[PDB]
Structure formats: structure tokens, C-alpha cells
Write a protein that holds these residues in place. Structure first.
Motif, PDB file in Angstrom:
ATOM      1  N   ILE A 112       0.866  -1.179   0.000  1.00 10.89           N
ATOM      2  CA  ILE A 112       0.000   0.000   0.000  1.00 10.89           C
ATOM      3  C   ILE A 112       0.900   1.226   0.000  1.00 10.89           C
ATOM      4  O   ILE A 112       1.713   1.404   0.916  1.00 10.89           O
ATOM      5  N   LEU A 113       0.750   2.067  -1.022  1.00 13.97           N
ATOM      6  CA  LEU A 113       1.511   3.302  -1.173  1.00 13.97           C
ATOM      7  C   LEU A 113       0.577   4.489  -0.996  1.00 13.97           C
ATOM      8  O   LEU A 113      -0.400   4.630  -1.740  1.00 13.97           O
ATOM      9  N   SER A 114       0.882   5.333  -0.013  1.00 14.42           N
ATOM     10  CA  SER A 114       0.218   6.617   0.176  1.00 14.42           C
ATOM     11  C   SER A 114       1.111   7.697  -0.418  1.00 14.42           C
ATOM     12  O   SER A 114       2.246   7.884   0.033  1.00 14.42           O
ATOM     13  N   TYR A 115       0.597   8.408  -1.421  1.00 16.23           N
ATOM     14  CA  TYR A 115       1.391   9.388  -2.154  1.00 16.23           C
ATOM     15  C   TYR A 115       1.390  10.739  -1.445  1.00 16.23           C
ATOM     16  O   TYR A 115       1.010  11.756  -2.034  1.00 16.23           O
ATOM     17  N   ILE A 116       1.820  10.753  -0.181  1.00 16.41           N
ATOM     18  CA  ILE A 116       1.873  11.952   0.651  1.00 16.41           C
ATOM     19  C   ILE A 116       3.254  12.005   1.289  1.00 16.41           C
ATOM     20  O   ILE A 116       3.745  10.992   1.798  1.00 16.41           O
ATOM     21  N   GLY A 117       3.878  13.175   1.253  1.00 14.40           N
ATOM     22  CA  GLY A 117       5.186  13.333   1.853  1.00 14.40           C
ATOM     23  C   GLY A 117       5.846  14.611   1.383  1.00 14.40           C
ATOM     24  O   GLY A 117       5.249  15.429   0.677  1.00 14.40           O
ATOM     25  N   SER A 118       7.102  14.762   1.794  1.00 12.48           N
ATOM     26  CA  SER A 118       7.886  15.924   1.413  1.00 12.48           C
ATOM     27  C   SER A 118       8.247  15.858  -0.069  1.00 12.48           C
ATOM     28  O   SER A 118       7.984  14.870  -0.761  1.00 12.48           O
ATOM     29  N   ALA A 130       8.845   3.586 -11.768  1.00 11.16           N
ATOM     30  CA  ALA A 130       9.331   2.721 -12.837  1.00 11.16           C
ATOM     31  C   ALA A 130       9.399   1.258 -12.414  1.00 11.16           C
ATOM     32  O   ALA A 130       9.292   0.373 -13.270  1.00 11.16           O
ATOM     33  N   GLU A 131       9.573   0.984 -11.127  1.00 11.92           N
ATOM     34  CA  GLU A 131       9.656  -0.392 -10.652  1.00 11.92           C
ATOM     35  C   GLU A 131       8.285  -1.060 -10.770  1.00 11.92           C
ATOM     36  O   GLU A 131       7.303  -0.495 -10.270  1.00 11.92           O
ATOM     37  N   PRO A 132       8.148  -2.232 -11.405  1.00 12.72           N
ATOM     38  CA  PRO A 132       6.833  -2.882 -11.417  1.00 12.72           C
ATOM     39  C   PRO A 132       6.448  -3.390 -10.037  1.00 12.72           C
ATOM     40  O   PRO A 132       7.298  -3.672  -9.190  1.00 12.72           O
ATOM     41  N   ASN A 133       5.135  -3.499  -9.820  1.00 10.06           N
ATOM     42  CA  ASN A 133       4.546  -3.949  -8.557  1.00 10.06           C
ATOM     43  C   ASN A 133       4.956  -3.059  -7.380  1.00 10.06           C
ATOM     44  O   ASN A 133       5.022  -3.519  -6.235  1.00 10.06           O
ATOM     45  N   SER A 134       5.228  -1.777  -7.638  1.00  4.49           N
ATOM     46  CA  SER A 134       5.553  -0.861  -6.549  1.00  4.49           C
ATOM     47  C   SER A 134       4.333  -0.591  -5.678  1.00  4.49           C
ATOM     48  O   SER A 134       4.447  -0.485  -4.451  1.00  4.49           O
ATOM     49  N   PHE A 135       3.158  -0.474  -6.296  1.00  2.00           N
ATOM     50  CA  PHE A 135       1.915  -0.251  -5.573  1.00  2.00           C
ATOM     51  C   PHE A 135       0.765  -0.816  -6.393  1.00  2.00           C
ATOM     52  O   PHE A 135       0.763  -0.710  -7.623  1.00  2.00           O
ATOM     53  N   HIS A 136      -0.202  -1.416  -5.699  1.00  2.00           N
ATOM     54  CA  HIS A 136      -1.396  -2.006  -6.299  1.00  2.00           C
ATOM     55  C   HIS A 136      -2.678  -1.293  -5.904  1.00  2.00           C
ATOM     56  O   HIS A 136      -3.568  -1.130  -6.742  1.00  2.00           O
ATOM     57  N   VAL A 137      -2.787  -0.871  -4.644  1.00  2.00           N
ATOM     58  CA  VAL A 137      -3.926  -0.111  -4.132  1.00  2.00           C
ATOM     59  C   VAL A 137      -3.388   1.232  -3.659  1.00  2.00           C
ATOM     60  O   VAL A 137      -2.492   1.280  -2.806  1.00  2.00           O
ATOM     61  N   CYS A 138      -3.938   2.315  -4.210  1.00  2.00           N
ATOM     62  CA  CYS A 138      -3.489   3.677  -3.945  1.00  2.00           C
ATOM     63  C   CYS A 138      -4.605   4.458  -3.267  1.00  2.00           C
ATOM     64  O   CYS A 138      -5.752   4.434  -3.728  1.00  2.00           O
ATOM     65  N   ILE A 139      -4.263   5.138  -2.174  1.00  2.00           N
ATOM     66  CA  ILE A 139      -5.170   6.026  -1.452  1.00  2.00           C
ATOM     67  C   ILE A 139      -4.432   7.345  -1.270  1.00  2.00           C
ATOM     68  O   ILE A 139      -3.262   7.351  -0.869  1.00  2.00           O
TER      69      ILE A 139
END
Length: 305
Positions: A112-118, A130-139
Motif C-alpha cells: 500500500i503506497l500513500s502518495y503523501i510526503g515531502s 518505474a519499478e513494477p509492482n511498486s503499488f497495487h492499491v493507492c489512497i
């Protein structure tokens, strides 16, 4: 228009078909959970809509456990269609932890990758895309999602889910236009309040129902609704009701869900104590109380109560 209505009526089961399954697709063994009759019928309807590539909107009331339905739909897609993702879910920052803990308990193997940060963290995440399977469910939150709207628009989202959107004040027309611009085979739209008699909202729902209209939005064909066209507007309202009828059907916790909890609000009469009785009689026998009773002044009797 007659053919679509007839096919929709034929697809919808009526009468005794809501107790006996008309489709021979048994539930998956790996699925953990109990499905009720209306839940099974709705799942069958959604599966038929997805298989036939026909758009539909589920207008079920909120609070009926949308997470269970979402899990069942993803399980059905993965078992048959293999659609593991990506899937977009938009919620406020206060709700990220709930879904994160739910996914961790149900499926710790999915990242689970949350696209929040500095800014540096965002740069590192962008390098990690670019890396495959880095995230599948995004919130993600609303503000950060709209900040990268151009970047996010490149990916076609399979399904659009929005929750608690009316609570945000300051909704510009550009955001709604961008939301309509997103193309998805299945579109879902939830209304947690009764339908208001507002022209703007109903116009937006009507446009969302039928995508790909060649007429420009800015080109209004009929304004200034004088008395001459009242019959035409009534006919248009009847036609819109006929169009919206088969795709919308309310289901309640009391009428349809007949596996009812045996609810009862018991009332226990309690005998007052002697001290309570003494205070009660003293307050009633107070001459001020009798004066308030005789005069009928609201604040006096209310305070006595």
C-alpha cells in the motif's frame, strides 16, 4: 430507447426469481462471507453489467457495508478477469488509517503506497514508479491528487469511487469537468442525502448518466422556460423518470432485508424512593409551582419539569 428499457426490464428478476438463483454461477469457495438474497441479486446484476460492458449505477443506501461488496467484486474480478489493479479510492486524510489497517489484516501481502510526503520523498516515489509492482492499491488526499491531475490523468482507472464529496465546500466547475473527463467502463456514484430540487445537481447527474453526448455543454438549447413549454418539460421529466427507474431501486434495512434483528426497546417502570417522593411532593406542593400551573408561563413550568 424502447429496446434498452425492455432489455433492462428483462434482465431485472421479478417475483419469485429473487428467492431462487436464475444464474448457475455458484459463489467461490475461497470467498469468506455470507451473501443474502438481495446481495446475491445485486452481485449478479453488477457482474452482468461488467460482462456486457453496459454502464450502471448502484443507488443503495449508505451504511450497508460497502467494503464487503468491494471485496467480493475484486475477488470475482481476480478469479475470473484477473483484474488485480490499479484501482483508485479517494478518501479524506482522516480515513487512510482505516483502509490501511483493513487491507493489512485482510491481505498483508499487498503493498500500500500513500502518495503523501515531502518534496524529496515525492521525488523518490516518482523514481520508484518505474519499478513494477511498486503499488497495487493507492489512497491519496484530495489536494495532492488534484495537484498531480495531469500526471494521474494518463492512467485509465477501471472504476471511480468517491466518498464524502459534498462535505467539501469550494467545488469548482473545472474539477467536475476533469472528473467527467476520466473514462471508465464501470461508473459508480453514491448519494448519501435525499435528492435536492436543484437544477445544477440534476443536470450533472443526467449528463453523467449518458456519456459521449455530441452537444456542447455551453450551447444551451432551450432557456427561459415560459408557460408554453410546460407540457414539454413535464414530458421530459416523465422520460427522465422512466430512464432512471430500472437502474435505481431503493433497498432498506426494514423492508427488503427480511433477516431482521429482533429489536425491541424495553421500558422499565421504576418505583421512586421515599426521598425522591418527598422531594417530588415538596416541589409540587410549592406555591410557586401552583402559581406557574395556574398562570401557564412557559419558562416557569419548564424549569419545574
Amino acid at each position: 430507447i424502447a429496446d434498452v428499457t425492455a432489455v433492462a426490464e428483462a434482465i431485472l428478476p421479478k417475483g419469485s426469481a429473487r428467492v431462487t438463483t436464475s444464474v448457475k454461477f455458484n459463489a467461490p469457495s475461497l470467498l469468506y462471507g455470507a451473501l443474502r438474497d438481495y446481495q446475491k441479486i445485486g452481485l449478479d446484476w453488477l457482474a452482468k453489467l461488467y460482462r456486457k460492458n453496459l454502464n450502471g449505477i448502484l443507488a443503495d443506501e449508505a451504511g450497508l457495508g460497502k467494503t464487503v461488496q468491494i471485496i467480493a467484486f475484486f475477488a470475482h474480478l481476480a478469479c475470473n478477469e484477473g483484474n488485480w489493479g490499479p484501482h483508485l479510492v479517494v478518501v479524506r486524510s482522516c480515513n487512510i488509517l482505516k483502509w490501511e489497517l483493513e487491507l493489512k489484516r485482510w491481505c498483508p501481502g499487498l503493498k500500500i503506497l500513500s502518495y503523501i510526503g515531502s518534496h524529496r520523498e515525492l521525488k523518490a516515489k516518482r523514481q520508484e514508479w518505474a519499478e513494477p509492482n511498486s503499488f497495487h492499491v493507492c489512497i491519496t488526499s484530495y489536494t495532492q491528487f488534484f495537484r498531480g491531475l495531469t500526471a494521474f490523468t494518463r492512467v485509465r482507472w477501471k472504476c471511480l469511487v468517491i466518498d464524502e464529496m459534498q462535505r467539501v465546500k469550494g467545488m469548482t466547475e473545472r474539477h467536475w469537468e476533469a472528473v467527467f473527463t476520466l473514462q471508465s467502463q464501470q461508473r459508480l456514484l453514491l448519494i448519501d442525502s435525499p435528492l435536492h430540487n436543484t437544477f445544477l445537481e440534476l443536470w450533472t447527474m443526467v449528463h453523467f448518466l449518458v456519456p459521449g453526448i455530441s452537444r456542447p455543454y455551453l450551447s444551451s438549447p432551450l432557456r427561459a422556460p415560459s408557460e408554453e413549454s410546460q407540457d414539454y418539460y413535464h414530458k421530459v421529466v416523465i422520460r427522465l423518470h422512466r430512464v432512471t427507474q430500472p437502474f435505481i431501486l431503493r433497498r432498506t434495512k426494514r423492508d427488503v432485508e427480511k433477516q431482521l434483528t429482533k429489536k425491541y426497546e424495553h421500558v422499565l417502570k421504576c418505583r421512586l424512593s421515599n426521598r425522591q417522593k418527598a422531594l417530588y411532593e415538596d416541589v409540587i406542593l410549592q406555591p410557586g409551582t401552583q402559581e406557574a400551573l395556574k398562570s401557564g408561563h412557559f419558562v416557569n413550568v419548564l424549569s419545574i419539569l
